[PDB]
Amino acid sequence: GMSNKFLGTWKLVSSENFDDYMKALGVGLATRKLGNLAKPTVIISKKGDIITIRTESTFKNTEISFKLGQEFEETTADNRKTKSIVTLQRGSLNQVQRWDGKETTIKRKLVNGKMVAECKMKGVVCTRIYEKV
Ligand SMILES: CCCCCC/C=C\CCCCCCCCCC(=O)O
Protein backbone atom coordinates (compact mmCIF):
# COMPACT_ATOMS: atom_id res chain seq x y z
CA GLY A 1 0.00 0.00 0.00
CA MET A 2 0.97 3.59 0.28
CA SER A 3 4.38 4.05 1.89
CA ASN A 4 4.27 5.11 5.52
CA LYS A 5 6.83 7.79 4.53
CA PHE A 6 3.88 9.80 3.10
CA LEU A 7 2.22 10.07 6.52
CA GLY A 8 2.52 13.40 8.27
CA THR A 9 2.48 17.10 7.55
CA TRP A 10 4.01 18.66 4.45
CA LYS A 11 4.60 22.36 3.64
CA LEU A 12 4.79 23.85 0.15
CA VAL A 13 8.25 25.27 -0.56
CA SER A 14 8.22 25.65 -4.36
CA SER A 15 5.57 25.89 -7.06
CA GLU A 16 6.31 25.99 -10.77
CA ASN A 17 3.65 26.76 -13.41
CA PHE A 18 0.66 26.81 -11.03
CA ASP A 19 -0.92 29.88 -12.66
CA ASP A 20 -1.13 28.14 -16.04
CA TYR A 21 -2.42 24.97 -14.35
CA MET A 22 -5.22 26.91 -12.66
CA LYS A 23 -6.00 28.66 -15.96
CA ALA A 24 -6.37 25.26 -17.62
CA LEU A 25 -8.84 24.28 -14.90
CA GLY A 26 -10.95 27.36 -15.65
CA VAL A 27 -10.05 29.31 -12.49
CA GLY A 28 -10.57 33.07 -12.82
CA LEU A 29 -8.04 35.81 -12.18
CA ALA A 30 -8.88 36.95 -8.67
CA THR A 31 -8.90 33.34 -7.45
CA ARG A 32 -5.64 32.60 -9.26
CA LYS A 33 -3.91 35.57 -7.66
CA LEU A 34 -4.77 34.14 -4.20
CA GLY A 35 -3.89 30.61 -5.31
CA ASN A 36 -0.48 31.75 -6.48
CA LEU A 37 0.18 33.33 -3.07
CA ALA A 38 -1.00 30.32 -1.07
CA LYS A 39 1.57 28.13 0.59
CA PRO A 40 -0.53 25.21 1.90
CA THR A 41 0.16 22.46 4.33
CA VAL A 42 -0.88 19.02 3.30
CA ILE A 43 -1.58 16.41 5.97
CA ILE A 44 -1.63 12.76 4.87
CA SER A 45 -3.06 10.23 7.32
CA LYS A 46 -4.55 6.73 7.20
CA LYS A 47 -7.06 4.76 9.31
CA GLY A 48 -7.16 1.17 8.22
CA ASP A 49 -7.33 1.22 4.42
CA ILE A 50 -8.82 4.75 4.28
CA ILE A 51 -6.26 7.42 3.37
CA THR A 52 -7.00 11.11 4.01
CA ILE A 53 -5.31 14.05 2.28
CA ARG A 54 -6.14 17.37 3.99
CA THR A 55 -4.95 20.67 2.54
CA GLU A 56 -4.93 23.78 4.73
CA SER A 57 -4.25 27.35 3.67
CA THR A 58 -5.52 30.80 4.58
CA PHE A 59 -7.46 30.94 1.31
CA LYS A 60 -8.95 27.41 1.11
CA ASN A 61 -9.03 24.11 3.00
CA THR A 62 -9.86 20.77 1.31
CA GLU A 63 -10.07 17.19 2.42
CA ILE A 64 -10.45 13.88 0.61
CA SER A 65 -10.71 10.41 2.07
CA PHE A 66 -10.45 7.34 -0.13
CA LYS A 67 -9.48 3.74 -0.58
CA LEU A 68 -6.95 2.95 -3.27
CA GLY A 69 -8.65 1.86 -6.49
CA GLN A 70 -12.13 2.98 -5.44
CA GLU A 71 -13.70 5.95 -7.25
CA PHE A 72 -15.23 8.66 -5.12
CA GLU A 73 -16.93 12.03 -5.41
CA GLU A 74 -14.62 14.99 -4.79
CA THR A 75 -14.98 18.74 -4.20
CA THR A 76 -11.86 20.48 -5.36
CA ALA A 77 -10.37 23.70 -3.94
CA ASP A 78 -11.73 25.66 -6.94
CA ASN A 79 -15.13 24.18 -6.31
CA ARG A 80 -15.26 21.42 -9.21
CA LYS A 81 -17.46 18.35 -8.55
CA THR A 82 -15.35 15.49 -9.90
CA LYS A 83 -15.34 11.71 -10.07
CA SER A 84 -11.92 10.87 -8.72
CA ILE A 85 -9.70 7.87 -8.10
CA VAL A 86 -6.37 7.41 -6.36
CA THR A 87 -4.10 4.46 -7.15
CA LEU A 88 -0.43 3.55 -6.76
CA GLN A 89 2.18 3.15 -9.45
CA ARG A 90 5.76 2.40 -8.41
CA GLY A 91 4.99 3.88 -5.05
CA SER A 92 3.64 7.17 -6.52
CA LEU A 93 0.21 8.18 -5.13
CA ASN A 94 -1.67 9.09 -8.28
CA GLN A 95 -4.98 10.98 -8.37
CA VAL A 96 -7.22 11.43 -11.40
CA GLN A 97 -10.16 13.85 -11.42
CA ARG A 98 -12.87 13.77 -14.06
CA TRP A 99 -15.64 16.16 -14.76
CA ASP A 100 -17.58 17.49 -17.76
CA GLY A 101 -15.54 15.43 -20.19
CA LYS A 102 -12.24 16.86 -18.81
CA GLU A 103 -9.49 15.21 -16.82
CA THR A 104 -6.55 16.27 -14.65
CA THR A 105 -3.93 14.22 -12.83
CA ILE A 106 -2.00 14.92 -9.63
CA LYS A 107 0.83 12.47 -9.00
CA ARG A 108 2.41 12.72 -5.53
CA LYS A 109 5.76 10.98 -5.14
CA LEU A 110 8.58 10.91 -2.61
CA VAL A 111 11.90 12.17 -3.96
CA ASN A 112 14.89 12.30 -1.56
CA GLY A 113 12.41 12.66 1.34
CA LYS A 114 10.51 15.60 -0.24
CA MET A 115 6.99 15.16 -1.65
CA VAL A 116 6.66 16.26 -5.27
CA ALA A 117 3.20 16.85 -6.72
CA GLU A 118 3.07 16.84 -10.53
CA CYS A 119 -0.17 18.42 -11.71
CA LYS A 120 -1.19 18.03 -15.43
CA MET A 121 -4.15 19.58 -17.32
CA LYS A 122 -4.17 19.77 -21.05
CA GLY A 123 -0.52 20.46 -21.98
CA VAL A 124 0.23 22.21 -18.72
CA VAL A 125 2.57 20.66 -16.23
CA CYS A 126 2.91 22.15 -12.77
CA THR A 127 5.37 20.92 -10.14
CA ARG A 128 4.89 21.59 -6.41
CA ILE A 129 7.58 20.56 -3.92
CA TYR A 130 6.84 20.01 -0.24
CA GLU A 131 9.10 19.63 2.80
CA LYS A 132 8.09 17.40 5.70
CA VAL A 133 7.39 19.47 8.76
C1 LIG B 1 -6.26 24.54 -1.34
C2 LIG B 1 -5.02 25.30 -1.45
C3 LIG B 1 -4.28 25.50 -2.78
C4 LIG B 1 -5.16 25.98 -3.81
C5 LIG B 1 -5.51 27.45 -3.62
C6 LIG B 1 -6.28 28.02 -4.78
C7 LIG B 1 -7.64 27.46 -4.87
C8 LIG B 1 -8.24 26.96 -5.98
C9 LIG B 1 -7.70 26.80 -7.35
C10 LIG B 1 -7.65 25.36 -7.86
C11 LIG B 1 -6.57 24.49 -7.39
C12 LIG B 1 -6.55 23.01 -7.59
C13 LIG B 1 -5.25 22.39 -7.20
C14 LIG B 1 -4.82 22.30 -5.77
C15 LIG B 1 -3.43 21.75 -5.64
C16 LIG B 1 -3.20 20.28 -5.94
C17 LIG B 1 -1.75 19.88 -5.89
C18 LIG B 1 -1.15 19.94 -4.55
O1 LIG B 1 -1.68 19.36 -3.59
O2 LIG B 1 -0.07 20.64 -4.48
From Swiss-Prot:
Disulfide bonds listed in the record: C119-C126
Record organism: Homo sapiens (Human)
List of residues that carry N-acetylserine: S3
UniProt-listed PANTHER family: FATTY ACID BINDING PROTEIN
Record-linked InterPro entries: Calycin, Fatty_acid-bd, ILBP, Lipocln_cytosolic_FA-bd_dom, Myelin_P2
GO cellular component, one term: nucleus
Chain positions recorded as (9Z)-octadecenoate binding sites: R108, R128, I129, Y130
UniProt protein name: Myelin P2 protein
Amino acids binding hexadecanoate: R108, R128, I129, Y130
Name of the coding gene: PMP2
Transmembrane segments: none
Chief site of localization: cytoplasm
Keywords: Acetylation, Charcot-Marie-Tooth disease, Cytoplasm, Disease variant, Disulfide bond, Lipid-binding, Neurodegeneration, Neuropathy, Transport
